[PDB]
Design a protein around this ligand. Structure first.
Ligand SMILES: *[C@@H]1O[C@H](CO)[C@@H](O[C@@H]2O[C@H](CO)[C@@H](O[C@@H]3O[C@H](CO[C@H]4O[C@H](CO)[C@@H](O)[C@H](O)[C@@H]4O)[C@@H](O)[C@H](O[C@H]4O[C@H](CO)[C@@H](O)[C@H](O)[C@@H]4O)[C@@H]3O)[C@H](O)[C@H]2NC(C)=O)[C@H](O)[C@H]1NC(C)=O
Ligand SMILES: *[C@@H]1O[C@H](CO)[C@@H](O[C@@H]2O[C@H](CO)[C@@H](O[C@@H]3O[C@H](CO[C@H]4O[C@H](CO)[C@@H](O)[C@H](O)[C@@H]4O)[C@@H](O)[C@H](O[C@H]4O[C@H](CO)[C@@H](O)[C@H](O)[C@@H]4O)[C@@H]3O)[C@H](O)[C@H]2NC(C)=O)[C@H](O)[C@H]1NC(C)=O
Ligand SMILES: *[C@@H]1O[C@H](CO)[C@@H](O[C@@H]2O[C@H](CO)[C@@H](O[C@@H]3O[C@H](CO)[C@@H](O)[C@H](O[C@H]4O[C@H](CO)[C@@H](O)[C@H](O)[C@@H]4O)[C@@H]3O)[C@H](O)[C@H]2NC(C)=O)[C@H](O)[C@H]1NC(C)=O
Ligand SMILES: *[C@@H]1O[C@H](CO)[C@@H](O[C@@H]2O[C@H](CO)[C@@H](O[C@@H]3O[C@H](CO)[C@@H](O)[C@H](O[C@H]4O[C@H](CO)[C@@H](O)[C@H](O)[C@@H]4O)[C@@H]3O)[C@H](O)[C@H]2NC(C)=O)[C@H](O)[C@H]1NC(C)=O
Ligand SMILES: *[C@@H]1O[C@H](CO)[C@@H](O[C@@H]2O[C@H](CO)[C@@H](O)[C@H](O)[C@H]2NC(C)=O)[C@H](O)[C@H]1NC(C)=O
Ligand SMILES: *[C@@H]1O[C@H](CO)[C@@H](O[C@@H]2O[C@H](CO)[C@@H](O)[C@H](O)[C@H]2NC(C)=O)[C@H](O)[C@H]1NC(C)=O
Ligand SMILES: *[C@@H]1O[C@H](CO)[C@@H](O[C@@H]2O[C@H](CO)[C@@H](O)[C@H](O)[C@H]2NC(C)=O)[C@H](O)[C@H]1NC(C)=O
Ligand SMILES: *[C@@H]1O[C@H](CO)[C@@H](O[C@@H]2O[C@H](CO)[C@@H](O)[C@H](O)[C@H]2NC(C)=O)[C@H](O)[C@H]1NC(C)=O
Ligand SMILES: *[C@@H]1O[C@H](CO)[C@@H](O[C@@H]2O[C@H](CO)[C@@H](O)[C@H](O)[C@H]2NC(C)=O)[C@H](O)[C@H]1NC(C)=O
Ligand SMILES: *[C@@H]1O[C@H](CO)[C@@H](O[C@@H]2O[C@H](CO)[C@@H](O)[C@H](O)[C@H]2NC(C)=O)[C@H](O)[C@H]1NC(C)=O
Ligand SMILES: *[C@@H]1O[C@H](CO)[C@@H](O[C@@H]2O[C@H](CO)[C@@H](O)[C@H](O)[C@H]2NC(C)=O)[C@H](O)[C@H]1NC(C)=O
Ligand SMILES: *[C@@H]1O[C@H](CO)[C@@H](O[C@@H]2O[C@H](CO)[C@@H](O)[C@H](O)[C@H]2NC(C)=O)[C@H](O)[C@H]1NC(C)=O
Ligand code: LDK
Ligand code: LDK
Ligand code: NAG
Ligand code: NAG
Ligand code: CA
Ligand code: CA
Ligand code: CL
Ligand code: CL
Ligand code: NA
Ligand code: NA
Ligand code: ZN
Ligand code: ZN
Ligand code: ZN
Ligand code: ZN
Lengths: 692, 692
């Protein structure tokens, strides 16, 4: 039989292992020849695996690279201007790769050039609340200072934005062992911990969903008109560079000025964690000097797009996509995901060769330049936006398959909660102590829902991955799944040269059983979405979460009862819309289960109602000053791109409102956001009403 | 049989006459009790006629009314401040209506209050080119002057915007007999000409598609947050008032300063048409003083929405809509259209009572507050935007059925050209000298295509009517049809108290045969759109017009050959996209005619490709500073809302470019608009490619 069981049984751990090894022997940095060669390889293999068509979609986008003959580094300088300490020019390469060419040294992609000299201020994680504490409570002024911040907690672009708005003239990012060194585990290559010479790469853009900085709204094709750099979206205005903790120790050890305000500001290095500004009395005349010479360059990138045409609804698209470009070897990020996608294509192709076709079209994507701002997925979606918004059923992401070996982690739209519960009940747990038990059972046990006994945790989609354009801009139901660590006990070698095949094979998943389980979850989800007669979405699950989010946003507002009285701030409209959504979704579910099952139009009709429900939460005017974040329920946090925020428009209107100079205007805007949210929820509910 | 013939034969001239009489006995001004009563009447009658549901959709929108106890008027004042001439406080009411209550006196809706005193400048039609001539050629300065402008040529809101930007402190609008008095025809009530005491009402907003000035983007429902007046969209900043030509004679006769620059600046009054500024030497110390006391008020409006549920595709909507609100009696505008809609509903209801149903759902709308800025249609479409953009097949407008008795006038999307040609070949010409011949034959003879021998003229959609939100904001295929005058030989009594049932019955259409013909065209179009198995759109007709528009915009640019060389301005991408559109549409047409006719999915698929083709020309970012004009091919002219402009983004980038101070920046923006247009055309073409 050709059913989901046939598809799932065909997936093999050993194939994922072979593919991972194959994709991780050399660096695949976006815009390089090596990454074009791998694109062409994947194109060829997807054809052989049996897809109907496989094309490269290329774009010319702004990328960023260090100058090979003018290295980036940081110095301590004395009053003579002698550089008495210099940070490393590269990470010590791992065993057996000390002769690999074209390893890009650690840098912050899209940093401007500069050689700023100044006194250091230590800003903890450089979060919004960290700068509030510095400025408001401690009365420390970052204006004209170089800030040093530890990685962690929030996306690094938000740290740089926060540092900029505090008036910093430069940012040094470093990995603190408190955040990137698990107690009792050995450093690479003897364990999975970050060594002191390890450094996390990564872009520091604030794109807010725009894609290529030079072509917001439109694909960066051959005839594109590009903005000048001065008008580009999202570029930092101050120099930025990342370092490891050996180097960070040398910059922090001399820090004077104020003491850390409390213990949440101290990492694990043998230093005081003084906030500064500047060094202690003896070294008070030494300063920190950055040297950044990286250049921004328009460079060609290549997405691989494979199509498996649907037998019945060829004009309905289920998309499985993840990126291919890596900072260096990409042993976890992204090749642990890409190898899983490759094995999924191979399985689907096996069934197709035997005469099977999915009901709906499946599109498979190998995205480029994800590490430089989600550029490949975003430019392709800008090119194909009309096809995607009228035909896109769902998008399943496929970055790193593993970030630990403890349990499953799923982030998705509420529309997929039921699908995920049902699929995981069918799958075998790969976990020790759960042999012969379902993935649902092990997952629920290890990651209980905070709300419901007997169910597992499923999180909101945030951002920082290739689902962003599909979900937050276009309103296509999206989901992701991977294996994760026990958060009670990211990963230490994230975006370092040490992320290698050997890291995965030795320390994370020697038997490739977690990879296989993630292939089963991602592939199983795609199979159902592409093959179920009725789309496998449950609108009632959206109604439940909308009430939770309405309760939450109301509670935030109600911390200001006087102002709500003074400005007549009511949430009644939003609760009314949520109540209506609950009632209409209940009735729609009855019709879906009860409609005449022989009628394909009532079924195309009701499948269209299911497909366009996520779409209904899109506001074509976007959120304030963020035109490409259009989903009214979910946006990336304005304080942390990685985190999702619910009712983001109301949330941002309320954030720090007690500090606004004109409360009447501020609370007016809260009321405006309540109106927009209530309207959008009611409008989405009405898409599920009887159509005429 | 239940076919289009059955539908068409059921329509009766005598019923349209009875309905017109019924709808025109009392004024139906938006926001008044009389207009609510008529809404309730139409709701009741549409139910009795047999529609499945008929509801009122109400909104609370900004309207504008004169102060009943503080009348608007204009004076000439002497240096003592005696008012030696005053304009009329009302139009002399027509015979038999001198006792009708609640006739709103002539006013310019949305004028601010004020009593500005100054010297007059005469600005011809107050068009962009008229102000260019005043300022650039004649060196006349309007700053701090009261401008007097004759109605005609362009929408009055554009005149007021132009006057404002010239620094005018007030605007007087008047009807010149050159533009509103046909030679050899008698004034009302003895003929169809405007008498000297007649005045044209009308709003002077510049909404650019926004709808209610206080709630752009969102319906003005019960919980709406409204902008303050200071932030409202589209309101004029200087006082404005309309007058007739008896009064205009008194204001113009004393005008001094410069002579008219040529004969195109002189109307038909016995005055010099001096541009001013100010009066001749003897009267040089007299000034003009406006007194405007109208108030803006949020007021409830009511749309009637009737539904005839489709038998096969209930989730596909064909909409027939036109407005119900009038300035006074609405004898032509809009009741000649509303009576036609009423008879169309009655016919459809007759077939429905006999057991018939259309294939797709038909929605019928009686819009409110159209005269105050398309407010009723726009607020309803804002409320229902998600349903309309995923389910809207087509919108057929139904304002005034007649503006003359000469021949047919059709403005529509190219997608409907074939439908209109084929339907009119089936219909009987009502014209004298064409008995027994088709409407197509009489129409082609009297209104030949400027491009193609043997075919009739069909114009682009402009704006200024209720199709605007559906077509230019949401991208739903739209059309309109009415009987019109011979443009070789609008209508004189437009928006005056003299627009009555008697005007129509005596002078325009005594036998109601032109009304019946227009009912046949509008109803026939709705019938086909709602009933044809394959939607009756021909994508190849879009390809033909896109090449015409590309040629036209290229020609405009090529008036600047040096600059095109200097800034490397190429139209190659746009011609390439148009060529591709032509090729793909040709192949799609072959599949449509050749596909397996027994396959309803290939048919729903290909019907969806046809429905979403107009949708593909929408840019979600809108046009520059006009977020609600989103169609890249068609926008209302930025110089005249009534006129359509093709490739509006490129057109506006090129307009008056030789006057821009920074040519590099100006031509950069031309290139950006070429990129956006070429991309959008290619993207629309790709929606017609095979789907997978
Ligand atoms: C959740 O779902 C419910 C429906 O189950 C919606 O209920 C609607 O709520 C609105 C209030 O926001 C009601 O609006 C009121 O309508 C009255 C007229 O309604 C009748 O006629 C209309 C046609 O015009 C029909 O649509 C309707 O079926 C009724 O037959 C108005 O008279 C009311 O205005 C008066 O009172 C208010 C309040 O004091 C004043 O501000 C006004 O000045 C005026 O005096 C009012 O506008 C509406 O009738 C309800 N529809 C129903 C019950 O079907 C909720 O709105 C929805 N929630 C959201 C967020 O959309
Ligand atoms: C109208 O329809 C036609 C298709 O019939 C489109 O034609 C495309 O035109 C673009 C130019 O805008 C061509 O782009 C060129 O692609 C080359 C690679 O193409 C091959 O491989 C790709 C995958 O990456 C496949 O998609 C494709 O099928 C080919 O197999 C590039 O090498 C070219 O770049 C080089 O030359 C240019 C020009 O000098 C330089 O600027 C670059 O630096 C580089 O050296 C170029 O990008 C594309 O191949 C054409 N596709 C075809 C023929 O199928 C038109 O674009 C379309 N019109 C519009 C407005 O969309
Ligand atoms: C995840 O799995 C759960 C559990 O299987 C699943 O919920 C179940 O879905 C089925 C199918 O819709 C439900 O069965 C329906 O029950 C009602 C009431 O008993 C019946 O009226 C329905 O009968 C109609 O449809 C049948 C075909 O399904 C026809 O055979 C019949 O002639 C009728 O037309 C129907 O049997 C069942 O109640 C639920 N169980 C629950 C909710 O506990 C859920 O849908 C899955 N989630 C997905 C797929 O996303
Ligand atoms: C306006 O009217 C014109 C004139 O009637 C109309 O164009 C015509 O449309 C018909 C129907 O599509 C065309 O007929 C087709 O001709 C091709 C080539 O000869 C045939 O291959 C097609 O046959 C297929 O489809 C038939 C059903 O229509 C089946 O019976 C058959 O088995 C095949 O599947 C088909 O007969 C005809 O060529 C044109 N005439 C022209 C273009 O001159 C136009 O569509 C109308 N516009 C509308 C409705 O908007
Ligand atoms: C990854 O696997 C691919 C596919 O097997 C290898 O590419 C093949 O290389 C052989 C030998 O050079 C060629 O004959 C084939 O034409 C290639 N197939 C392709 C590109 O489709 C590739 O060598 C492997 N990479 C590594 C690093 O081992
Ligand atoms: C990268 O840095 C190198 C080395 O400093 C730069 O190459 C020099 O450029 C200057 C002019 O800008 C020349 O006068 C030198 O002769 C060059 N030196 C070498 C070693 O080639 C180069 O400008 C930088 N590359 C960039 C900005 O991409
Ligand atoms: C840090 O690196 C800098 C730059 O390479 C070193 O300073 C240079 O040293 C050479 C020879 O001693 C001088 O000729 C250059 O003029 C110096 N350049 C600058 C910018 O200072 C410095 O010696 C290094 N410091 C350490 C501790 O190795
Ligand atoms: C932090 O220090 C800078 C000075 O280095 C302050 O920035 C000044 O702001 C005032 C106006 O508010 C201007 O007159 C100065 O020109 C600014 N200085 C420069 C050179 O930019 C800033 O106000 C301080 N932050 C505090 C304590 O609020
Ligand atoms: C327009 O026609 C309507 C419908 O016939 C008339 O309204 C009817 O009036 C009669 C007598 O007052 C009532 O018995 C009916 O209930 C009304 N029908 C409705 C409102 O549906 C109306 O009087 C006519 N208007 C004019 C000006 O003649
Ligand atoms: C319309 O004009 C009338 C008449 O001038 C205004 O009514 C007067 O309002 C003032 C205060 O604004 C009172 O002191 C007078 O007693 C009122 N007179 C009358 C005749 O009632 C009224 O303000 C205006 N209405 C509006 C603005 O809608
Ligand atoms: C034009 O109308 C104005 C306002 O009604 C008239 O001027 C008023 O006349 C009365 C009595 O003569 C005075 O008490 C008022 O003070 C006047 N008001 C103003 C604002 O001037 C004027 O007489 C009328 N002119 C003509 C030609 O009839
Ligand atoms: C038309 O006349 C007005 C003066 O009445 C001019 O407007 C002035 O513009 C200059 C700056 O360009 C300012 O200094 C004045 O304050 C403005 N006047 C007022 C009172 O607004 C205008 O420039 C003239 N137009 C021409 C001839 O270009
Ligand atoms: O540019 C972006 O939006 C992010 C690009 C890249 N995305 S990622 O894959 O490396 N981010 C993690 C987020 C880490 C976490 O929150 O656990 C992920 O999605 O796995 C980065 O953060 O540099
Ligand atoms: O607010 C608007 O956009 C226009 C409202 C109203 N529309 S209209 O129906 O009166 N305009 C005419 C345009 C007259 C013409 O161009 O022949 C029409 O569409 O018939 C008006 O112009 O005041
Ligand atoms: C793999 O699982 C074991 C058992 O809990 C754990 O001790 C080890 O740290 C895990 N490896 C990684 C890389 O998380
Ligand atoms: C009606 O048609 C006749 C014949 O051409 C024409 O003379 C007359 O002016 C028309 N009436 C109107 C109102 O246009
Ligand atoms: Ca782009
Ligand atoms: Ca509105
Ligand atoms: Cl992922
Ligand atoms: Cl019309
Ligand atoms: Na493109
Ligand atoms: Na609403
Ligand atoms: Zn990454
Ligand atoms: Zn990644
Ligand atoms: Zn009108
Ligand atoms: Zn009208």
């Amino acid at each position: 039989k050709h059913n989901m069981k046939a598809f799932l049984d065909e997936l093999k751990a050993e194939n994922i292992k072979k593919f991972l090894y194959n994709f991780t022997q050399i660096p695949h940095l976006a815009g390089t020849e090596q990454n074009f060669q791998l694109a062409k390889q994947i194109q060829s293999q997807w054809k052989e695996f049996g897809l109907d068509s496989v094309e490269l979609a290329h774009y010319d986008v702004l990328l960023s690279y260090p100058n090979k003959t003018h290295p980036n580094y940081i110095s301590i300088i004395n009053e003579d201007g002698n550089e008495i300490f210099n940070t490393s020019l590269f990470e010590p390469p791992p065993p057996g790769y000390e002769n690999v060419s074209d390893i890009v040294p650690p840098f912050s992609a899209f940093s401007p050039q500069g050689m700023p000299e100044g006194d250091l201020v230590y800003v903890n994680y450089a979060r919004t609340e960290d700068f509030f504490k510095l400025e408001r409570d401690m009365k420390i002024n970052c204006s004209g200072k170089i800030v040093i911040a530890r990685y962690g907690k929030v996306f690094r672009g938000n740290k740089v934005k926060n540092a900029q708005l505090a008036g910093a003239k430069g940012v040094i990012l470093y990995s603190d062992p408190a955040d990137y060194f698990a107690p009792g585990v050995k450093s690479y290559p003897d364990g999975w911990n970050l060594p002191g010479g390890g450094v996390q790469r990564g872009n520091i853009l604030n794109l807010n969903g725009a894609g290529d900085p030079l072509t917001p709204g439109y694909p960066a094709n051959e005839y594109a008109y590009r903005r000048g750099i001065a008008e580009a979206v999202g570029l930092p205005s101050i120099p930025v560079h990342p370092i490891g903790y050996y180097d960070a120790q040398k910059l922090l050890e001399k820090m004077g000025g104020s003491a850390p305000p409390d213990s949440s500001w101290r990492g694990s290095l043998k230093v005081p964690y003084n906030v500064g500004p500047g060094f202690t009395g003896n070294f008070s005349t030494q300063k920190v000097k950055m040297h950044i010479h990286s250049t921004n360059e328009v460079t060609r990138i290549y997405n691989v797009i494979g199509t498996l045409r649907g037998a019945v609804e060829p004009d309905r698209y289920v998309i499985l996509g993840g990126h291919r470009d890596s900072w260096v070897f990409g042993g976890i990020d992204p090749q642990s995901g890409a190898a899983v996608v490759h094995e999924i294509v191979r399985s689907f192709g096996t069934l197709k060769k035997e005469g099977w076709r999915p009901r709906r079209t499946i599109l498979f994507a190998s995205w480029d330049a994800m590490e430089f701002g989600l550029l490949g997925s975003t430019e392709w979606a800008e090119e194909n936006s009309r096809l995607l918004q009228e035909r896109g059923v769902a998008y399943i992401n496929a970055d790193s398959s593993i970030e630990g070996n403890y349990t499953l982690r799923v982030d998705c739209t509420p529309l997929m909660y039921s699908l995920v519960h049902n699929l995981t009940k069918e799958l075998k747990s790969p976990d020790e102590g759960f042999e012969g038990k379902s993935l649902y059972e092990s997952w629920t046990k290890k990651s209980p829902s905070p709300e419901f006994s007997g169910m597992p945790r499923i999180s909101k989609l945030g951002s920082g991955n290739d689902f962003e354009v599909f979900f937050q801009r276009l309103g296509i139901a999206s989901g992701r799944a991977r294996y994760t660590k026990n958060w009670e006990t990211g990963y230490p070698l994230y975006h370092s040269v040490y992320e290698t095949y050997e890291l995965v094979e030795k320390f994370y998943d020697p038997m490739f059983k977690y990879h296989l389980t993630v292939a089963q979850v991602r592939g199983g989800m795609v199979f159902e979405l592409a093959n179920s007669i009725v789309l496998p979405f449950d609108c009632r699950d959206y109604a439940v979460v909308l009430r939770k989010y309405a309760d939450k946003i109301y509670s935030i507002s109600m911390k200001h009862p006087q102002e709500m009285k003074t400005y007549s701030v009511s949430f009644d409209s939003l609760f009314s819309a949520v109540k209506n959504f609950t009632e209409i979704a209940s009735k729609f579910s009855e019709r879906l289960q009860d409609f005449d099952k022989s009628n394909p139009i009532v079924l195309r009709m009701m499948n269209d109602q299911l497909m366009f429900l996520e779409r209904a939460f899109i506001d074509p005017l976007g959120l304030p000053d963020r035109p490409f974040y259009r989903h009214v329920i979910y946006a990336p946090s304005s304080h942390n791109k990685y985190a999702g925020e619910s009712f983001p428009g109301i949330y941002d209107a309320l954030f720090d409102i007690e500090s606004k100079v004109d409360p009447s205007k501020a609370w007016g805007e809260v009321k405006r956001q309540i109106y927009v949210a209530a309207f959008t929820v009611q409008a989405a509910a009405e898409t599920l009403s009887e159509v005429a």
